[PDB]
Amino acid sequence: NMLEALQQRLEKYQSVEAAAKAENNSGKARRFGRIVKQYEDAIKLYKAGKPVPYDELPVPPGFGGTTGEAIQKLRETENMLIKKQEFLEAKIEDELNIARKNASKNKEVALQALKKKKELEKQLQQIDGTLSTIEMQREALESANTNTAVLTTMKNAADALKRAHQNMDVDKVHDMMDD
């Protein structure tokens, strides 16, 4: 069904924003906070039998050498999307202040600032979904690269402990049996 998968995807975005609190990443907490607001709204709509904007909702990855250079390319792509988020956030607030100053004075200017603000928020929402997907994808790549590196040296350590486990007493008894 759709309700559970919608609930599963919400909890995932709730779990990432929560992790963004502890690491004190404000810009990440803001955009992941806006994504859970999309799902909280989609929850309210689905329970009310009203159409749900499925095309607007991002899906976390996996919800239905060159590895180091791939991580670096993703990090550099993240930075460009983060810079665009900050640009949109500042321009949205600028249009809100333009709309309020000219609410009664300049009717057509305040109305034009609101239309720009609405368009900028749509752009911010599309940046949110793409940037959040890349962040989680980059994190999974780094985690998979670390686990592989840790599993390899722990294997060398277990083999080193095995090599240093020579049953010299057993060899001594066998030595006296062959004499």
What does this structure look like?
The protein has two domains: 1-64, no CATH class; 65-179, no CATH class. 82% of the residues lie in helices and 0% in strands. The chain contains five helices and no strands. The chain has helices spanning 2-22, 26-47, 66-101, 107-163, 168-177. Helix 2 crosses helix 4 (107-163). The longest helix is centred in the last third of the chain and has 57 residues, at 107-163. The PDB classes it as transport protein.
Reconstruct the topology from this structure.
Elements (H helix, E strand, L loop, with lengths): L1 H21 L3 H22 L18 H36 L5 H57 L4 H10 L2
Protein name: Charged multivesicular body protein 4
GO biological process, one term: late endosome to vacuole transport via multivesicular body sorting pathway
Family: Belongs to the SNF7 family.
